[PDB]
Amino acid sequence: LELPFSNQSIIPAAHNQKDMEKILELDLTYMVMLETHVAQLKALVKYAQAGGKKVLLHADLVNGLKNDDYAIDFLCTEICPDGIISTRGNAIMKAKQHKMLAIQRLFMIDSSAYNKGVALIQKVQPDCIELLPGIIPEQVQKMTQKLHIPVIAGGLIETSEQVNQVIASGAIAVTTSNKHLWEGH
């Protein structure tokens, strides 16, 4: 059972309410919602799902809402995106209880971030992992050959060269808010 974004290379990442309007006119099925407001949240998910778009929601970037177990409960029972993204391990564990697509965010900062992060991945067993930045193809290569969980890469992807390089390294897809390559591939 491969991940539901098979043959979708770009997963657009919305910072705005206006950014989701831009991507509602696109052939790509999965989207990413980056910064949000807990007040407008339920509407924004249902409005995006009304346009045939499946939502990956940043659990950590919901203003007014923690990333508590209670907060993840809220996302799964009352907001219902198609998947959640968190950097917190407890949120990945909780989302898996609710049979949610739990993708774990990792920041390729240093060797310490790698070591602690691979240990966390090992513990919580996420459905997927997002690696940032998405412009280090050899780190995406190293990571994929470690466990085989599928990895998305995201962050700082400007060109189609970079999309190709990282996807050929082992990435299943790319997340990006670079507006140019939303209609490019």
Structural write-up:
There is one protein chain. With 185 residues, the chain is an alpha/beta fold. It has one domain (1-185): Aldolase class I (TIM Barrel, Alpha-Beta Barrel), CATH 3.20.20. It has helices at 18-23, 41-50, 69-79, 89-97, 111-124, 137-147, 160-167, and strands spanning 10-14, 30-33, 36-37, 54-58, 62-63, 83-86, 101-107, 128-132, 151-154, 171-176. Strand 8, helix 6 (137-147) and strand 9 (151-154) form a beta-alpha-beta unit. Helix 3 packs across helix 4, helix 4 (89-97) packs parallel to helix 5 (111-124) and helix 6 (137-147) runs parallel beside helix 7 (160-167). The relative contact order is 0.15. It is classed as transcriptional regulator.
Shape: globular
**What CATH architecture label applies?**
Alpha-Beta Barrel
CATH fold label: TIM Barrel
Largest sheet: 8 strands, parallel, barrel
Overall SS class: alpha/beta
What percent of residues are in strands?
Answer: 15-25%
C-alpha-based Rg, rounded:
15 Å
CATH homologous superfamily title: Aldolase class I
Number of helices: 7
CATH top level assignment: Alpha Beta
> Termini distance?
25 Å
Task: Tally the structural domains.
Answer: 1
Helix content: 25-40%
Helix-strand pattern, N to C?
EHEEHEEHEHEHEHEHE
Strand count = 10
Major β-sheet strand ordering: 1-2-4-6-7-8-9-10
Write the layout of secondary structure elements.
Blueprint lengths: L9 E5 L3 H6 L6 E4 L2 E2 L3 H10 L3 E5 L3 E2 L5 H11 L3 E4 L2 H9 L3 E7 L3 H14 L3 E5 L4 H11 L3 E4 L5 H8 L3 E6 L9
Parallel strand pairs: 1-2, 1-10, 2-4, 3-5, 4-6, 6-7, 7-8, 8-9, 9-10
Helix pairs in contact: 3-4, 4-5, 6-7
